[PDB]
Write a protein that binds this ligand. Structure first.
Ligand SMILES: O=C(c1ccccc1)c1ccccc1
Ligand SMILES: O=C(c1ccccc1)c1ccccc1
Lengths: 159, 155
């Protein structure tokens, strides 16, 4: 026989995530204007369809682009996705706080690039959200006069 | 299983704004001085100060701003930024900060703000796992980009 089915409950991990480090066997891919110099914003895991949606930003041709990629899991355990070629992505380490992954990309010219990455989750606990809303209510502030900086398109540029 | 010793200076590092509320909506609307995107906070126990590093859009352009707040005997902080500010920390832990700020501008107008900020924690064991994986794939350390420091020092 082989290995047995892997238990999964990644739905919980969905939410805002950020890029910490990305390594590459080909520096061109992550250098300025590179296709994989990706600033993550959000990750959504769906245990039913067995997919992962990536929402990130990349600067291309001097302009900033918000990209949405959808990855599909395989019996293999790895995920496949189309972005600047074909990608085979593997989650090496995962938890409520971090994600260490390895990705293999083959561009249109058949060039194979291997990338490693570390991403961290921006966790907002319910207890702390309640403390904010109560405080906000005590100061007589209208829910309408509250801005969400986690999901706002009008944000600073890292480069 | 181990955890770093808890210290105030241990709270220093990359922080992000989650929510900001204002009694005066104009202060946090686009081009408002308090629509602040936090980058880093630096706490200093000995000196009784907190250094704020954030970005704010003004006249269609992003500005990086640094503000140093000083603690008072009553535990609150004072800071000079678009008038005088009295900053109060309502709840603080390794992962979150809830604060109340009172601001009085150069015209005598008072605005009361509330905010929820979160810290971006990078654990030592997670960094090691990343570096072990990176070397396993024969990736040179100079072929690695630090995205966190780019976002913390934008332009
Ligand atoms: O930005 C990555 C990526 C972006 C879009 C599709 C697949 C992967 C990536 C980089 C390094 C490791 C793992 C994933
Ligand atoms: O922008 C804030 C601020 C920035 C610099 C000095 C004082 C206050 C702030 C926002 C929300 C809650 C508490 C304080």
């Amino acid at each position: 026989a082989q290995e047995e089915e892997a238990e999964q409950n990644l739905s919980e991990l969905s939410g805002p995530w950020r890029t910490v480090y990305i390594g590459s066997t080909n520096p061109e891919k992550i250098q300025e204007n590179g296709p994989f110099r990706t600033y993550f914003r959000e990750l959504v895991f769906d245990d039913e369809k067995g997919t992962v949606d990536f929402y990130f930003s990349v600067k291309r041709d001097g302009k900033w682009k918000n990209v949405h990629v959808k990855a599909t899991k395989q019996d293999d355990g790895t995920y496949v996705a189309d972005y600047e070629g074909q990608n085979v992505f593997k989650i090496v380490s995962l938890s409520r706080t971090h994600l260490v992954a390895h990705n293999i990309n083959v561009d249109k010219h058949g060039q194979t690039t291997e990338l490693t990455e570390l991403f961290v989750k921006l966790n907002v606990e319910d207890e702390d959200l309640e403390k904010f809303w109560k405080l906000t209510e005590d100061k007589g502030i209208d829910k309408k006069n509250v801005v969400n900086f986690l999901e706002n398109e009008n944000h600073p540029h890292p480069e």
